[PDB]
Amino acid sequence: EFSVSYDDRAIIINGKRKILISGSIHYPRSTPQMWPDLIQKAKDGGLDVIETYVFWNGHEPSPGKYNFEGRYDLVRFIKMVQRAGLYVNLRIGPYVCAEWNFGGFPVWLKYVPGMEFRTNNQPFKVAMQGFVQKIVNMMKSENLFESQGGPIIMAQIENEYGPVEWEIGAPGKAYTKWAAQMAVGLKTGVPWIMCKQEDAPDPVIDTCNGFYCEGFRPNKPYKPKMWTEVWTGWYTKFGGPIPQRPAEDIAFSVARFVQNNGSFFNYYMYHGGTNFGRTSSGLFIATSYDYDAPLDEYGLLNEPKYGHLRDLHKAIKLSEPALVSSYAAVTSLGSNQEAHVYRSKSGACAAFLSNYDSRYSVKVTFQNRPYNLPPWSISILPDCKTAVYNTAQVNSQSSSIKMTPAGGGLSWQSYNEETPTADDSDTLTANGLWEQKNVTRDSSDYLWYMTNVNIASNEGFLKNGKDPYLTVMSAGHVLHVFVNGKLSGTVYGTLDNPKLTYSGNVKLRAGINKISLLSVSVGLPNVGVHYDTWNAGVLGPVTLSGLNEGSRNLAKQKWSYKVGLKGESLSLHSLSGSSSVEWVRGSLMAQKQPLTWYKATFNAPGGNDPLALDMASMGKGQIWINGEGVGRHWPGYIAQGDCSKCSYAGTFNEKKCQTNCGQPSQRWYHVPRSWLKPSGNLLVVFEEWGGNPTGISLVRRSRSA
Ligand SMILES: *[C@@H]1O[C@H](CO)[C@@H](O)[C@H](O)[C@H]1NC(C)=O
Numbered sequence: 017e018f019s020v021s022y023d024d025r026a027i028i029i030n031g032k033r034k035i036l037i038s039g040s041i042h043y044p045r046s047t048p049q050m051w052p053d054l055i056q057k058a059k060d061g062g063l064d065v066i067e068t069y070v071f072w073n074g075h076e077p078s079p080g081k082y083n084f085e086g087r088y089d090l091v092r093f094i095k096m097v098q099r100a101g102l103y104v105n106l107r108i109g110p111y112v113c114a115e116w117n118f119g120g121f122p123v124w125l126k127y128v129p130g131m132e133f134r135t136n137n138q139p140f141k142v143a144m145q146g147f148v149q150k151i152v153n154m155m156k157s158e159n160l161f162e163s164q165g166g167p168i169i170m171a172q173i174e175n176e177y178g179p180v181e182w183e184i185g186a187p188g189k190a191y192t193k194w195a196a197q198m199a200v201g202l203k204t205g206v207p208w209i210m211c212k213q214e215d216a217p218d219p220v221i222d223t224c225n226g227f228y229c230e231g232f233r234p235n236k237p238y239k240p241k242m243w244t245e246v247w248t249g250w251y252t253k254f255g256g257p258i259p260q261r262p263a264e265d266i267a268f269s270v271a272r273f274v275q276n277n278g279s280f281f282n283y284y285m286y287h288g289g290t291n292f293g294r295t296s297s298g299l300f301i302a303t304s305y306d307y308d309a310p311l312d313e314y315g316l317l318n319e320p321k322y323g324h325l326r327d328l329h330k331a332i333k334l335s336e337p338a339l340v341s342s343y344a345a346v347t348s349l350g351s352n353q354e355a356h357v358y359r360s361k362s363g364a365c366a367a368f369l370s371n372y373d374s375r376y377s378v379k380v381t382f383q384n385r386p387y388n389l390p391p392w393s394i395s396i397l398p399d400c401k402t403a404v405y406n407t408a409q410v411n412s413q414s415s416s417i418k419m420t421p422a423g424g425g426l427s428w429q430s431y432n433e434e435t436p437t438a439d440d441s442d443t444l445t446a447n448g449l450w451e452q453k454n455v456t457r458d459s460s461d462y463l464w465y466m467t468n469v470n471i472a473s474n475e476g477f478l479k480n481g482k483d484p485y486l487t488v489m490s491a492g493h494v495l496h497v498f499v500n501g502k503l504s505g506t507v508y509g510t511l512d513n514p515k516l517t518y519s520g521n522v523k524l525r526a527g528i529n530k531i532s533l534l535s536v537s538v539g540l541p542n543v544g545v546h547y548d549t550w551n552a553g554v555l556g557p558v559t560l561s562g563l564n565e566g567s568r569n570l571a572k573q574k575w576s577y578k579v580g581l582k583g584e585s586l587s588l589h590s591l592s593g594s595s596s597v598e599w600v601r602g603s604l605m606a607q608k609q610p611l612t613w614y615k616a617t618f619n620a621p622g623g624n625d626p627l628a629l630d631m632a633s634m635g636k637g638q639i640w641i642n643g644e645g646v647g648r649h650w651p652g653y654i655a656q657g658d659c660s661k662c663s664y665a666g667t668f669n670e671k672k673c674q675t676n677c678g679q680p681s682q683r684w685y686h687v688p689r690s691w692l693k694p695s696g697n698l699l700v701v702f703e704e705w706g707g708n709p710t711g712i713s714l715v716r717r718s719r720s721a
Pocket residue numbers: 024276277343344345346
């Protein structure tokens with residue numbers, strides 16, 4: 017009925033070789049009502065395939081219970097791509113990286129007895145095969161593979177394992193062989209792929225990720241050349257800038273790939289979207305996953321990038337009959353110039369004329385005709401005679417972003433978060449320090465490390481003008497130090513270095529002194545060899561210096577623990593949770609105070625424009641609207657890095673075109689209209705650092721010229 021195969025040239029769909037233009041759109045980083053519009057714009061962008069990861073931890077929060085409703089409705093998403101007449105590349109994983117919490121793995125998976133992530137491990141294999149098996153079965157049951165008449169033309173198993181296999185050695189090769197054998201053994205009827213897998217076993221095709229992938233070649237001569245990730249920009253991290261990749265560079269890199277035998281490429285990302293809630297983003301990754309994608313975070317067209325790529329795809333589609341019926345033949349044109357010519361026995365001719373010089377514009381002669389090639393550009397001649405397209409020459413409209421305030425300020429109400437201290441009636445205690453994930457299981461960002469310090473009256477610092485010295489070392493990621501219910505200092509880390517040290521003088525009086533430590537995790541690591549084994553939270557050393565005794569090792573004593581916030585267990589984020597009205601309705605009330613809840617009621621602004629929250633007046637925490645988590649906020653973390661002016665021309669790197677530095681890492685936070693009633697919308701903000709609620713504004717996202 018239907019079939020998907022491959023050869024040395026391309027992917028074969030229904031007996032025909034296909035040059036496939038793909039774009040990556042992750043379903044849980046958007047709302048179910050946004051999906052149709054995003055998929056439509058992708059279709060209009062010239063994409064044949066929609067690519068997406070499958071997010072395990074979002075699907076299986078409990079060892080047994082599954083979730084496939086709301087924006088985690090994977091089956092809804094794929095059927096929507098079908099209704100748009102497009103194909104799907106399903107990158108299953110289960111490891112997805114994706115700047116996604118814990119790399120996509122559920123946190124409970126770590127605590128299954130004898131477990132080891134991404135290796136020749138029995139508990140892992142069982143767990144891995146179970147979920148992968150479930151996903152394939154679900155896809156079959158709704159007839160979603162191309163062989164059944166569905167959109168799914170290929171699937172990915174694992175993500176960029178090559179580098180890990182290298183470091184871990186023999187268990188790595190065994191697991192790879194297993195993973196491949198297992199995946200293919202599921203009889204999907206469609207080919208399987210593996211990115212960054214130089215030794216992917218047959219019949220799995222190894223693919224390429226990166227900014228450029230033209231020099232790439234598969235591990236077998238009978239396997240097609242595929243680029244699973246054309247990085248359209250880079251992710252944003254809290255503390256970091258907003259990176260961008262120029263459209264002219266992307267188009268050049270794509271052209272370099274197509275001209276040189278490349279038959280499949282995928283834009284990572286085509287739509288980046290948002291990291292809603294507290295289980296989406298990876299370690300220190302911002303809520304915004306804009307990625308400088310052709311479709312911005314809010315689903316608006318990122319111009320000129322969208323249109324310029326749309327024109328590129330039109331040129332490739334015009335060149336397609338030749339591309340599938342011939343191979344790339346190189347003819348030198350000059351010192352830094354080449355012509356890749358696709359000449360069919362039928363007589364079809366497509367030519368790509370390149371200029372790799374990034375300094376000067378160059379003129380070449382191809383088949384008696386002159387061509388002017390801008391620096392660092394490729395011209396496409398679909399008929400071999402006339403150049404319809406050039407990668408450095410944008411004929412699409414540019415546009416800027418404006419955030420227009422909608423309505424006015426809100427009447428705010430405030431609730432204080434308690435500062436818990438160690439009691440003798442505490443059940444969850446230990447004679448030392450515990451790791452944060454071990455305790456919280458990522459059910460909350462917050463964990464309280466509590467202990468009591470007894471200060472004898474014969475102490476030296478009490479009689480004279482001396483202060484005791486406290487040193488608290490944490491593995492990450494934010495630490496708040498409270499002595500006797502009062503804040504003594506705050507430290508926070510970076511993505512590269514999340515480990516923390518607090519140091520300072522403390523106010524200790526005679527008797528029992530209570531120490532309260534609040535340890536916050538800002539997402540979990542998603543990449544790295546043995547990344548799951550990395551620590552979070554206060555594990556010491558924890559010392560109290562300046563006593564009659566030299567220095568007291570506070571790590572070696574009884575510690576109480578409390579998971580989450582009193583504000584969380586009371587479920588203050590939802591409307592039915594915000595019932596314990598200990599809310600200060602005060603005309604004059606809470607402002608710039610740590611650990612504070614806020615709530616206001618608003619009406620949905622009149623129009624079609626997408627919405628955000630200007631939170632520049634605030635510090636850090638998380639946001640809910642009508643019970644649904646908008647995600648974390650951290651406008652208090654200012655963007656760091658070198659942010660020079662950049663030219664499209666020349667080799668790109670993540671740091672080449674960085675913007676928004678000396679500014680809040682993220683200021684506006686995406687609010688889907690899909691989440692709003694016409695009136696009586698509940699807006700709950702937990703403010704961890706301290707900020708002014710009256711400053712918070714609802715804004716309208718508009719782009720033009
Ligand atoms: C394109 O692939 C064919 C098939 O192997 C090969 O003979 C040819 O050298 C390739 N062209 C280039 C420019 O690499």
